[PDB]
Design an enzyme around this catalytic site. Structure first.
Site, PDB file in Angstrom:
ATOM      1  N   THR D   1      53.220 -60.523  16.604  1.00 11.91           N
ATOM      2  CA  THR D   1      53.884 -59.084  15.932  1.00 11.91           C
ATOM      3  C   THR D   1      54.078 -58.138  16.677  1.00 11.91           C
ATOM      4  O   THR D   1      52.989 -58.099  17.565  1.00 11.91           O
ATOM      5  CB  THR D   1      53.003 -59.220  14.947  1.00 11.91           C
ATOM      6  N   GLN D   2      54.924 -57.785  17.407  1.00 19.77           N
ATOM      7  CA  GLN D   2      55.775 -57.010  17.740  1.00 19.77           C
ATOM      8  C   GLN D   2      55.781 -56.033  17.010  1.00 19.77           C
ATOM      9  O   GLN D   2      56.098 -55.768  16.093  1.00 19.77           O
ATOM     10  CB  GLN D   2      57.009 -57.772  18.822  1.00 19.77           C
ATOM     11  N   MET D 107      55.149 -66.300  14.710  1.00 22.13           N
ATOM     12  CA  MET D 107      54.955 -65.319  14.510  1.00 22.13           C
ATOM     13  C   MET D 107      55.113 -64.349  15.831  1.00 22.13           C
ATOM     14  O   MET D 107      54.200 -63.926  15.679  1.00 22.13           O
ATOM     15  CB  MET D 107      54.317 -65.258  13.229  1.00 22.13           C
TER      16      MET D 107
ATOM     17  N   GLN G   1      56.411 -54.109  10.707  1.00 24.89           N
ATOM     18  CA  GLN G   1      55.248 -55.571  10.514  1.00 24.89           C
ATOM     19  C   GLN G   1      56.839 -56.616  10.947  1.00 24.89           C
ATOM     20  O   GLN G   1      57.570 -56.887  10.412  1.00 24.89           O
ATOM     21  CB  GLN G   1      54.332 -56.391   9.821  1.00 24.89           C
TER      22      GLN G   1
END
Ligand SMILES: [Mg+2]
Ligand SMILES: [Mg+2]
Ligand SMILES: [Mg+2]
Ligand SMILES: [Mg+2]
Ligand SMILES: [Mg+2]
Ligand SMILES: [Mg+2]
Lengths: 195, 195, 211, 233, 4, 204, 222, 125, 221, 195, 195, 4, 4, 4
Positions: D1-2, D107, G1
């Site tokens: 997640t970025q 992810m 997110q």
């Protein structure tokens, strides 16, 4: 508020001395200019703990580089910083300016924002207080300035950044990187405030 | 509250209503009558939110009784059901709506026909041969679909109702402490004491 | 909607054929019975893929048992392979409501209910699915041990029709199965489209519906 | 997640009769701050492929290194590294497309939208898109971000379908791109005036144009506009 | 996904 | 807890040659549980027909409300309301409840008694008017009805032909929706005769 | 997110004849309200007279088709160039899909071809690997629009023999390839009118014993 | 981990380590099994060079694997305990999954499988 | 997709004819070109009912105002009344309007957002297809357009939306408001999305549909 | 990016022309300088809808003030702005600079931030792009500048604000308030960009 | 699952366990035995999360049966309870803990004494004269506090248990379809068939 | 809802 | 939204 | 935490 500026004889790093825990100043005489090698220094902005841990690892990497391959380039130092900042971007809050003096490449400045990207520039500004001096620095910066001109440019720039940014203040520390060697400079409120 | 059933047969409407009043992990009462007589030939069973049920039932009862005295005339089951539906239809867009589901069993003396109306708390009215509110329907409807005939007697209707209570007592998770059964016909409203 | 009950003449197993994607009717021609072996049946309720994939896999494990042990697997052992499998996936979000029905010499006619939260129950009568309550209603009220094979087949078929009618998420067709000492027998596919009107007319039931 | 930090905006591209054109401005935005003005977002791979990248610049610089490393690796034990076994646009794309989908599947995506423009060994035009999700598609015109909304409509007036490509010259195609870049400067709040443009022609090869500027801009009509309605003065 |  | 898909149901309207058709299913449920197979969703005020899908309490309420309004209209105007006018009344009435709306999908159908022109219209729950030459769809199987009507429909159908087209459009759309079906009604409307037909459909 | 899934829209349709089978899909690829490509095929010849489409999230769709094509290749290597039967291909795809049960391929998958008796076959899958053989299946964005039309015109649902009092159903019969393509073209033109994510072009892959033929038709580009 | 292949083939096609293991069995006290019409009897020799033994607490030669199956042995006593323990665990594991005690054939097949595994596993005799 | 373009002797507005509910086309030929007064027309985007309701309410109050003052209504009056109404409802009335017209003061072109902000311009675009349209307007717009040039530019800006935006489609509606002349409303000025002949007629044999009951409905008194 | 600067002959207002809906420029030729009275103008920053509604009400109040009590002071105008901004602080996002020319009080500048507080200053800067020119404006601002000096000061200041702020751009509009009257000025990118 | 009781009397331990297995609004089974025999003189009743209960009970049963075969000796009730407690004490800090409450009724043949252990899913062990899990305790404990004597016979214990079931059938909201009763004494474990 |  |  |  931190900045590094290239000039005729090499490069100068400048920074404020203010460390905040909210609105409380935890340290008003902080040294935010850290030596990773003889003539490669860095400006630390963001998490004190994160930038400290990174700078320590880089200093270790360049000490081990020197033992094997001799003096590293400023570009090499910036690459090691980037590699740590980019690969650990999810767990780090560090904005670092890398400035060094080669004899071949003279003065060089690399800025590493939050993302972990690298940007080689004539001069770089960073930290919360940098936002207030984008206009000033862009209008007043010239290439191939003298030492005295560059010291005045940094002093006036950080003076304004300190004046407007509550997160910045205390003394203006500067570090001069030339063929002559390494010179530490300090400037107290009573001087820079009334510029 | 929980289980309320209704079966319209040839010459009468039969309402079965559970006797249990549960709060928390305690059955406070096992002899509760979840019905009000609106008029001599109109009976309303109710189930839903604690307090709301009785407060709503008695409010309707008062209004129908007031109409009966004013006009010296009994409102038709169809007329009473329409009045009740409109009160719930108003309620649902109020600041605090009545959370009450009702069955209205009545004998229309002008048509000489039994009539069963199912109205939920939203004010959704339907005339049915057999009706139920809550989880009761999920068992009884499929059972009545099979065993129900339109020309059945009151005695045949009570046996058909016994079949529903037996099925609910077997497969329902909660002990509802049996039912109070009431018959609405040409001669008015009477209670079956041995069920 | 699916049921399976034990009686005098063995086991009846009946299921519907509707698949739902929310309020979307995905299919009306779904096979919700898997034939594991001539003496073992599996009913699929819950996740279309979860039930299909793991009961086909169960059939592979039952085949490996009779290769290794030179003997057809017990209904108890077959059901417990599946129940022990899903229990390993407990909390991961598998959706499986299953009845494992079959005959063996040592057990006789046996039905095992197995769901995705690890529950495993032996029992005579089971109804599973969104329409389980509608099927229970008809089945319970008409069930006797001494039902004939003819009457038992009809009650299973009629119990599904009842749920197919009321439950919005049940319908399509009825698939009937009979399980004896000799094994399982398929008793055909019955479209609710025709079956409903045929039952209504002949039985005189479903008076709620406009004839 | 970025979350992307230093970002590049629209990359626009189209096919013409003999090859492909691609362009992208020289800006590295830091949110609303227009922080870096010397950023090259077109990266040539050999003399027959250009990769235009938008989104996170730290992730873009990572992809630069992968492509640079890919050229090195291809040259290893390869006597035909500058001939028959030279890197094709199709090879470079599929590599990135593989990486992008693997990273989304872990992810931990590369927060980028990429357009690979080039010419294959047989003269066929190559133009294909891939993004942080690993989603790929090809079209006579391709554009990222605002470019998708504002450039594609203008470029599709020139090349609406496949049959229009042989009828489109490099002069007409380049004019349409430069016009699109001006429109994006008018209307994209994270665009700059300065941009780079690359032409990969099957005859003249790779022409890489730096330090281009948006020009012939219409601002004059602004002098006549007062208040927001009733204001006469 | 589909899911009687 | 989506008001438009608790009770379920569908309405479809079509235009033919000098005629209109409006059809609805008969289901009323509480989500999965089917409750009533006699719940008609088409009403009429003189020669103007109104079908209403959505939350059943609001369907009943609006029928009662438009009966109220068309009765006062007729007493004051001394003539029956026309479809074009009634359409505007429905739109007004719905938009009056803009920030507390009736969870409904109404459909107007009828023939103008003066001009003889077939007229249909649909509305969103907030009152936006959807006028159409060909057909209007509403309910929990609106997607299905759109797909059926768009393929089956052709202009200037005779009443007997139009009946088959609308009937097949509703039935096959209803059988792909869980919350629709359980019986169906079709109104064939000519200038001065109206035929109402109950369709035989699968009861699942 | 970060959201790892996206919706590339489009719609697909598989019909099975007596001695043939068709798998049709529109050539439009979209994200939100933007058109990405007016011609991006998503119906593929996978070899062994199997045609396949995985409609929904194109990245997952391309990944699955790529993995199945690879599965066919290794089936030949490991089993002496044996032809992969449509029923065997279907079961194989179930294991591919279910292999990601806890991080699914966001695709409605359809394959078409001939069974081992030479008769037309269509298999349809959900995202997690549940599959079923059918005469008829629409998948994707406009599935809800097309599928009830197919029920009516292919399987003749709700259609009774005239004058039989609705007692005798319309008899089931196989359609000619000409009749099936008519239904496909009318299905997509209807879907294009009422679904914003459907249009641009229609590509049909027809499968006979003679091999795989293609047909392309323009659709409305609005 | 210790990997050495201790059980290997010899030129004449013999696995000496397996054959030398049989010599250990030949050294062990005699054990006999006789099955009648409705029973099985396990007889076991106990060497009489050991007096001042405590027969209450001394490991018995016949071991119960389950309530319905017994195992006697000849050879290394220490080795037998490892097979008995594994067999007893597999006996309870079978009851747990199959809901039925092991057959004598199944329990034998398991013990024999364990013995075989130790003839072509690295680092074990 | 709605646009407004100023020219020599007046102003032109145009719109597409697509109405949507989620991904479904509710109406294939709705009219988003609304009349506030004879020579003041409004193009509406956002919540379809809100654009219609707010246009009719202000249109009604403008008519009453025109009768009260014995004067032809002004665009700035319609602009002021719309923006004060929309602002009062803090954007909860999702109407995004292009207001254009001619009055005694001259020719005018404004845009209104749902929150009650107003803009002035020679060329404007609003809606989901605004970026496709504005791209065309920014490319081809110039000072001193003729009537025929402005209609072409306007319809071209709408076409960009129809083709490239999924939210826009079907036909092009235009309204030309020139000074000293009657406003001409050009309903379906372009119809470039005509449905092709179907491959087959789905007209059923009569008696196909099974029927349970028939009854004559009484509509008379 | 907006600013108002007092000088010898009166006061000058300056602003960019960029209106954003996210990263999309809804209007690139916006007029953010609004006349509330003959020689009282305001600079609008924040919500376009909020600042528009406020400015319209103030224009109404000062028109009614003029009808009764004659020409209002610039302080009076600022007070009316404050009264609206302060009392509706919970529902408003408006940062407004008020600038006016009296003959007695000459040029005056009042800044009204988000809170609704009033600050009378020699010059004022506001909007997203103002942050980048705090340093520049503080170093370069002088009291009693000429018209040409003040125009250059605003032009250079907004030029930098536009350069760094993505939310700012287009043309630089300026409005000169002196005894002479009201003068509108415009400056195009081709000029100010290359300062 | 739900109702499990235990009463230790003079010469035996009596465990009562509800027969209902409910899922959703359906009683799937009304003849369920919520107990496993761990050893000839040790019985464990269980209640809690679906699946977990039987999986845990059978796992314990397997381990105790393995111990019995290995040592040719029955573990004391105290020893079995301590083993079970430790397994649950491990469980509670696992990735997915066993949500199972148990009563362990055993007759210690060495002490010639009945023993009742109550262990919750946390691994909280207590030896008691009478025990219960879930809501059952809130009725039975106060009832047994009154009527229980330590020197009671098995027959007196069954009558005391009948008094508990009657009270639960009267005041418990849910139908638990009666109980299976089992006695643990010197002669082992036997089931009461008529309760 | 309906919503160019 | 519109918002220097 | 400490944080120019
Ligand atoms: Mg149903
Ligand atoms: Mg369901
Ligand atoms: Mg249905
Ligand atoms: Mg379309
Ligand atoms: Mg800018
Ligand atoms: Mg405890």
């Amino acid at each position: 508020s931190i900045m590094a500026v290239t000039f005729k004889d090499g490069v100068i790093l400048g920074a404020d001395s203010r460390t905040t825990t909210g609105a409380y100043i935890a340290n008003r005489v902080t040294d935010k200019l850290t030596r990773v090698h003889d003539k490669i220094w860095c400006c630390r902005s963001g998490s004190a703990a994160d930038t400290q841990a990174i700078a320590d690892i880089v200093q270790y990497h360049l000490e081990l580089y020197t033992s094997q391959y001799g003096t590293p380039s400023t570009e090499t130092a910036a690459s090691v910083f980037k590699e740590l900042c980019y690969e650990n971007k999810d767990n780090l809050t560090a904005g670092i300016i890398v400035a060094g003096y080669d004899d071949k490449n003279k003065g060089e400045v690399y800025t590493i924002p939050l993302g972990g990207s690298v940007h080689k520039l004539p001069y770089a500004i960073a930290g919360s207080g940098s936002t207030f001096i984008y206009g000033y620095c862009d209008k007043n910066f010239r290439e191939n300035m003298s030492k005295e001109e560059t010291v005045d440019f940094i002093k006036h720039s950080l003076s304004q950044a300190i004046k407007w940014d509550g997160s910045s203040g205390g003394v203006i520390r500067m570090v001069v990187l030339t063929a002559a060697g390494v010179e530490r400079l300090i400037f107290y409120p009573d001087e820079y405030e009334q510029l | 509250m929980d289980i309320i059933l209704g079966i319209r047969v040839q010459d009468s409407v039969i309402l079965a209503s559970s006797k249990a009043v549960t709060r928390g992990i305690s059955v406070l009462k096992d002899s509760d009558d979840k019905t009000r007589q609106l008029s001599p030939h109109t009976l309303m069973s109710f189930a839903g939110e604690a307090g709301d049920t009785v407060q709503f039932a008695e409010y309707i009862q008062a209004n129908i009784q007031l109409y009966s005295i004013r006009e010296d005339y009994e409102l038709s089951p169809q007329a009473v059901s329409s009045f009740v539906r409109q009160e719930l239809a108003k309620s649902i867009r109020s600041r605090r709506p009545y959370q009450v589901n009702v069955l209205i069993g009545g004998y229309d003396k002008k048509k000489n026909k039994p009539e069963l109306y199912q109205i939920d708390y939203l004010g959704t009215k339907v005339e049915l041969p057999y009706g139920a509110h809550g989880y009761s329907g999920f068992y009884t409807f499929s059972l009545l679909d099979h065993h129900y005939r339109p020309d059945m007697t009151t005695e045949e209707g009570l046996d058909l109702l016994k079949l529903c209570v037996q099925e609910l007592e077997k497969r329902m998770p909660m002990d509802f402490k049996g039912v109070i059964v009431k018959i609405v016909d040409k001669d008015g409203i009477r209670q079956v004491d041995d069920f | 909607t699916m049921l399976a009950f034990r009686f005098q003449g063995g086991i009846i197993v009946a299921v519907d054929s509707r698949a739902t994607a929310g309020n979307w009717v995905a299919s009306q021609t779904v096979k919700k019975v898997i034939e594991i072996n001539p003496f073992l049946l599996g009913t699929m309720a819950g996740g279309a893929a979860d039930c299909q994939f793991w009961e086909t896999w169960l059939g592979s494990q039952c085949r490996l048992h009779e290769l290794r042990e030179k003997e057809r697997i017990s209904v108890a052992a077959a059901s417990k392979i599946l129940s022990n499998l899903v229990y390993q996936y407990k909390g991961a979000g598998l959706s499986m409501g299953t009845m494992i029905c079959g005959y063996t010499r040592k057990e006789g006619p046996t039905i095992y209910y197995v769901d995705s939260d690890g529950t495993r129950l032996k029992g005579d009568i089971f109804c599973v699915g969104s329409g389980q309550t509608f099927a229970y209603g008809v089945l319970d009220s008409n069930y006797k041990w001494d039902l004939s094979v003819e009457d038992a087949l009809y009650l299973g078929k009629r119990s599904i029709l009842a749920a197919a009618h009321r439950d919005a998420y049940s319908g399509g067709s009825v698939n009937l199965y009979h399980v004896t000492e000799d094994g399982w027998i398929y008793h055909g596919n019955h479209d609710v489209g025709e079956l409903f009107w045929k039952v209504k007319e002949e039985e005189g039931s479903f008076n709620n519906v406009i004839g | 997640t970025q979350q992307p930090i230093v970002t590049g905006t629209s990359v626009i591209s189209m096919k013409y009769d003999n090859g492909v054109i691609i362009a992208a401005d020289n800006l590295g935005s830091y949110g609303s701050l227009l922080r870096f003005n010397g950023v090259e977002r077109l990266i040539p791979v050999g003399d027959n492929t250009v990769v235009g990248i938008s989104g996170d610049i730290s992730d873009m610089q990572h992809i630069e290194r992968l492509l640079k490393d890919l050229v090195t690796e291809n040259a290893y034990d390869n006597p035909l590294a500058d001939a028959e076994e030279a890197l094709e646009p199709s090879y470079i794309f599929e590599y990135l497309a593989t990486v992008m989908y693997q990273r989304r599947s872990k992810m931990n995506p590369l927060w980028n939208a990429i357009i690979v423009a080039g010419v294959q060994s047989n003269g066929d035009q190559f133009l294909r898109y891939v993004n942080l999700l690993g989603v790929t598609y090809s079209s006579p015109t391709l554009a990222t971000g605002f470019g998708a909304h504002m450039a594609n409509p203008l470029l599709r007036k020139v090349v609406d379908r496949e049959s229009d490509i042989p009828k489109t010259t490099v002069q007409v195609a380049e004019e349409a791109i430069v016009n699109a870049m001006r429109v994006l400067y008018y209307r994209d709040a994270r665009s700059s005036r300065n941009f780079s443009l690359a032409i990969i022609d099957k005859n003249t090869g790779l022409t890489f144009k730096k330090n281009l500027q948006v020009e012939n801009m219409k601002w004059d009509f602004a002098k006549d506009i007062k208040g927001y309605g009733t204001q006469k003065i | 996904x589909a899911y009687x | 807890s989506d008001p438009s898909s608790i009770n379920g149901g569908i309405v479809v309207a079509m235009t033919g040659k000098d005629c209109v058709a409006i059809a609805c299913d008969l289901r009323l449920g509480s989500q999965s549980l089917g409750v009533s197979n006699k719940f008609e969703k088409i009403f009429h005020y003189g020669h103007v027909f109104l079908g209403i899908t959505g939350l059943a309490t609001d369907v009943t309420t609006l029928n009662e409300m438009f009966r109220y309004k068309t009765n006062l209209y007729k007493l004051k105007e001394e003539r029956a309301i026309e479809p074009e006018t009634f359409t505007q009344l429905v739109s007004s009435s719905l938009y009056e409840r803009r920030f507390g709306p009736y969870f409904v999908g109404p459909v107007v159908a009828g023939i103008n008694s003066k001009s003889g022109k077939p007229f249909i219209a649909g509305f969103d729950l907030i009152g936006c008017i959807d006028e159409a030459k060909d057909f209007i769809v509403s309910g929990t199987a609106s997607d299905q009805l759109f797909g059926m009507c768009e393929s089956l429909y052709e202009p200037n159908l005779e009443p007997e032909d139009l009946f088959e087209t609308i009937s097949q459009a509703l039935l096959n759309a209803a059988d792909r929706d869980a919350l629709s079906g359980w019986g169906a009604v079709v109104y064939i409307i000519k200038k001065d005769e109206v035929v109402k037909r109950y369709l035989k459909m699968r009861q699942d | 997110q970060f959201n790892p899934y996206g919706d590339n829209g489009g719609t697909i349709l598989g019909i099975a004849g007596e001695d043939f089978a068709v798998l049709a899909g529109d050539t439009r690829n979209i994200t939100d309200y933007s058109i990405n490509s007016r011609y991006e095929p998503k119906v593929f010849d996978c070899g062994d007279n199997i045609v396949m489409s995985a409609n929904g999230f194109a990245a997952d769709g391309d990944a699955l088709v790529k993995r199945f094509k690879n599965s066919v290749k290794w089936y030949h290597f490991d089993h002496n160039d044996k032809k992969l039967s449509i029923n065997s291909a279907a079961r194989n795809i179930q294991h591919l899909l279910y292999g990601k049960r806890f991080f699914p391929y966001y695709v409605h998958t359809i394959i078409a071809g001939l069974d081992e008796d030479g008769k037309g076959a269509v298999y349809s899958f959900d995202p997690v690997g549940s599959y079923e053989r059918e005469q008829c299946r629409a998948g994707g964005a406009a599935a809800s629009l097309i599928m009830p039309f197919l029920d009516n015109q292919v399987n003749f649902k709700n259609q009774y023999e005239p004058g039989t009092n609705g007692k005798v159903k319309k008899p089931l019969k196989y359609l000619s390839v000409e009749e099936v393509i008519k239904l496909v073209r009318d299905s997509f033109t209807s879907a294009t009118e009422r679904h914003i994510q459907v249009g641009d072009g229609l590509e049909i892959l027809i499968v006979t014993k003679d091999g795989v033929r293609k047909e392309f038709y323009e659709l409305k580009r609005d | 981990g210790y990997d050495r292949a201790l059980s290997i083939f010899s030129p004449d096609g013999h696995i000496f380590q397996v054959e030398y293991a049989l010599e250990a069995v030949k050294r062990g006290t005699c054990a006999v099994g006789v099955k009648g019409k409705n029973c099985v009897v396990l007889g076991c020799e106990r060497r009489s060079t050991l007096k001042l033994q405590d027969t209450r607490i001394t490991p018995s030669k016949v071991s119960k694997i389950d309530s319905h199956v017994v195992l006697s042995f000849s050879g290394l006593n220490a080795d037998s305990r490892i097979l008995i323990e594994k067999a007893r665990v597999e006996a309870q594991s079978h009851r747990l999954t199959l809901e039925d005690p092991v057959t004598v054939e199944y329990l034998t097949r398991y013990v024999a499988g364990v013995q075989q595994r130790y003839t072509q596993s690295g680092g074990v005799r | 997709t709605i646009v407004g373009v100023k020219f020599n002797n007046g102003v032109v507005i145009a719109a597409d004819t697509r109405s949507t509910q989620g991904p479904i086309v509710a109406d294939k030929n709705c009219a988003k070109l609304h009349r506030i007064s004879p020579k003041i027309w409004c193009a509406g985007a956002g919540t379809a009912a809100d654009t219609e309701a707010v246009t009719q309410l202000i249109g009604s109050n403008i008519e009453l105002h025109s009768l009260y003052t014995s004067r032809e209504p002004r665009v700035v009056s319609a602009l002021q009344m719309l923006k004060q109404h929309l602002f009062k409802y803090q954007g909860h009335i999702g109407a995004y309007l292009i207001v254009a017209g001619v009055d005694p003061t001259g020719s005018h072109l404004f845009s209104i957002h749902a929150h009650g902000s107003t803009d002035v311009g020679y060329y404007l675009s609003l809606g989901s297809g605004s970026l496709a349209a504005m791209a065309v307007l920014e490319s081809h717009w110039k000072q001193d357009l003729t009537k025929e040039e402005a209609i072409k530019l306007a319809s071209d800006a709408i076409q960009a939306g129809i083709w490239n935006d999924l939210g826009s489609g079907s036909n092009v509606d235009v309204c030309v408001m020139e000074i000293g002349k009657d406003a001409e409303y050009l309903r379906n000025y372009l119809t470039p999305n005509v449905r092709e002949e179907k491959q087959k007629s789905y007209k059923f044999p009569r008696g196909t549909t099974a029927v349970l009951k028939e009854s004559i409905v009484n509509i008379c008194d």
